[PDB]
Design a protein around this motif. Structure first.
Motif, mmCIF file in Angstrom:
data_model
loop_
_atom_site.group_PDB
_atom_site.id
_atom_site.type_symbol
_atom_site.label_atom_id
_atom_site.label_comp_id
_atom_site.label_asym_id
_atom_site.label_seq_id
_atom_site.Cartn_x
_atom_site.Cartn_y
_atom_site.Cartn_z
ATOM 1 N N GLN A 16 0.826 -1.202 0.000
ATOM 2 C CA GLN A 16 0.000 0.000 0.000
ATOM 3 C C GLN A 16 0.863 1.255 0.000
ATOM 4 O O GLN A 16 1.953 1.268 0.566
ATOM 5 C CB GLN A 16 -0.940 -0.020 1.212
ATOM 6 C CG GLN A 16 -1.190 1.326 1.867
ATOM 7 C CD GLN A 16 -2.232 1.241 2.963
ATOM 8 O OE1 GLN A 16 -2.765 0.166 3.245
ATOM 9 N NE2 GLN A 16 -2.533 2.376 3.586
ATOM 10 N N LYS A 17 0.369 2.309 -0.640
ATOM 11 C CA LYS A 17 1.112 3.558 -0.724
ATOM 12 C C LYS A 17 1.032 4.356 0.570
ATOM 13 O O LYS A 17 -0.042 4.521 1.149
ATOM 14 C CB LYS A 17 0.605 4.416 -1.885
ATOM 15 C CG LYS A 17 1.281 5.784 -1.958
ATOM 16 C CD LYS A 17 1.481 6.248 -3.389
ATOM 17 C CE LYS A 17 0.242 6.930 -3.942
ATOM 18 N NZ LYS A 17 0.267 6.968 -5.425
ATOM 19 N N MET A 29 5.835 3.016 -1.525
ATOM 20 C CA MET A 29 5.099 1.757 -1.481
ATOM 21 C C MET A 29 5.614 0.880 -0.345
ATOM 22 O O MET A 29 6.773 0.455 -0.341
ATOM 23 C CB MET A 29 5.209 1.013 -2.813
ATOM 24 C CG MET A 29 4.411 1.647 -3.946
ATOM 25 S SD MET A 29 2.640 1.768 -3.618
ATOM 26 C CE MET A 29 2.183 0.040 -3.542
ATOM 27 N N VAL A 30 4.740 0.627 0.622
ATOM 28 C CA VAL A 30 5.067 -0.191 1.777
ATOM 29 C C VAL A 30 4.356 -1.527 1.647
ATOM 30 O O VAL A 30 3.178 -1.650 1.986
ATOM 31 C CB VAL A 30 4.664 0.506 3.091
ATOM 32 C CG1 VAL A 30 4.987 -0.367 4.292
ATOM 33 C CG2 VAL A 30 5.366 1.851 3.201
#
Ligand code: NA
Length: 16
Positions: free
Chosen positions: A2-3, A15-16
């Motif tokens: 997710q960003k 982006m993680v």
């Protein structure tokens, strides 16, 4: 993944 956005300059879209 997710960003995640943060400030460091630049507003960074990570982006993680
Ligand atoms: Na900083």
């Amino acid at each position: 993944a997710q960003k995640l956005v943060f400030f460091a300059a630049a507003i960074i879209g990570l982006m993680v």
